Paper text:
Francisella virulence arises from a 33 kilobase (Kb) pathogenicity island (FPI) that is regulated by the macrophage locus protein A (MglA) and the stringent starvation protein A (SspA). These proteins interact with both RNA polymerase (RNAP) and the pathogenicity island gene regulator (PigR) to activate FPI transcription. Indeed, while most bacterial SspA proteins function as homodimers to activate transcription, F. tularensis SspA forms a heterodimer with the MglA protein, which is unique to F. tularensis. Thus, our structure unveils MglA as a new member of the SspA subclass of GST proteins.
To gain insight into the function of the F. tularensis MglA protein we determined its structure by multiple wavelength anomalous diffraction (MAD). The crystal contains two molecules of MglA in the asymmetric unit (ASU), which form a dimer. The structure was refined to final Rwork and Rfree values of 17.3% and 22.8%, respectively to 2.95 Å resolution. MglA homodimerization is primarily electrostatic and is mediated by 14 salt bridges formed between residues on α4 and α5. Specifically, Arg64, Lys87, Arg89, and Arg93 interact with Asp59', Glu70', Asp74' and Glu97', respectively (where ' indicates the other subunit in the dimer). Indeed, similar to what is observed in SspA proteins, MglA dimerization is largely mediated by contacts between one region from each subunit. Thus, the combined SEC and crosslinking data demonstrate that while MglA appears to preferentially heterodimerize with SspA, it can form weak homodimers in solution. Finally, the MglA structure revealed malate, which was used in crystallization, bound in an open pocket formed by the dimer, suggesting the possibility that this cleft could function in small molecule ligand binding.
Author numbering:
A (entry chain B): 0 to 143, 152 to 205
B (entry chain A): 0 to 147, 152 to 203
């Protein structure tokens, strides 16, 4: 019924795949890195300007902005909730999602590209280290057994890509490290991480 | 008690002000570009990262992305509904709204930029002109496919402002179809639209 176009190590794809896993959604997931799916790649380029990844296409429409991929999924698949149920927290959450998107996710992708001036990269990593603890801190504050939230899920993926890019979390706090280790341990997260593009 | 930080000739501000108009919410609009509201501007610069415009301010929060603004306004004034109320339809509508946002709204803001290059001004105009009519048709098709038409949706309101701004930026509306012309004129002379553009 539903189609998700993905790439093997895209934090965005990983996020949308986890969200689809947690929801009861069943969607065909296609990795356009693989030749075996070249047809799908061709199609992707037709239905989006740059053949963006990830793209979620219902039969009707196709979307590549993360925020509205998440929104569309949340409308099609209401349960379980990815967002707060009350307008203040829900709105502030939406702003936060946009913030994490600007600061960490986009930058993680920027880091993946090999054209980048090494020093330039080093800046980006450094900024990320600068804001990671504070961001994690707002996300826990907004959280105030509990359901997983879209912000916590995304931040789990952020910590996981920090690990991938050999970036070390700047905290001495014991509890924070226990918490981050605890996030990285969720079953769906690992389930998603094990199967790279699907 | 709402407070909408706007600036003049901003398509987003106008869209939102009409949203509030329609919702019947009474909100204090503030033109941040105006000198007499400089204090307000200062305040905005505290509660927002980059002096974001528009920004809606409630007793509880401030929000600034258009999707997020329409969202909050709806949470606090759900009736009448801007989006469909059934999941599938509502989803398509959000996606289509994002499309109009990327293709049109954002590009209109681009064309207003004071440092605008001529090459990219032409790129943008040509892009928009090339797509506007098929986009408009997608909107009316989605409209009439399942619904059902007394009250208006966000897609139609926004496409009305896109047309209005095509005019405001001296871009010819590329159609000769007499039906579509009639429809566009009907859109452009809808009560709340005129009430919105001529009371600023």
């Amino acid at each position: 019924a539903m189609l998700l176009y993905t790439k093997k190590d895209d934090i965005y794809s990983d996020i949308v795949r986890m969200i689809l896993l947690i929801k009861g959604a069943n969607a065909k997931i296609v990795d356009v890195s693989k030749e075996e799916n070249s047809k799908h790649l061709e199609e992707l380029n037709i239905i989006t300007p740059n053949g963006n990844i990830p793209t979620l296409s219902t039969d009707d429409f196709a979307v590549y902005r993360l925020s509205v991929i998440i929104e569309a999924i949340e409308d099609l698949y209401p349960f379980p909730p990815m967002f707060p149920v009350f307008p203040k927290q829900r709105a502030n959450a939406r702003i936060l999602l946009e913030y994490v998107n600007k600061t960490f996710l986009q930058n993680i992708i920027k880091l993946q590209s090999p054209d980048l001036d090494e020093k330039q990269a080093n800046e980006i990593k450094m900024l990320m280290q600068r804001d990671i603890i504070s961001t994690y801190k707002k996300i826990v504050s907004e959280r105030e057994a509990q359901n997983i939230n879209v912000l916590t899920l995304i931040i789990t993926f952020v910590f996981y890509y920090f690990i991938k890019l050999k970036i070390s979390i700047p905290t001495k706090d014991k509890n924070i490290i226990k918490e981050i280790k605890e996030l990285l341990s969720e079953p769906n997260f690992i389930k998603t991480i094990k199967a790279k593009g699907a």
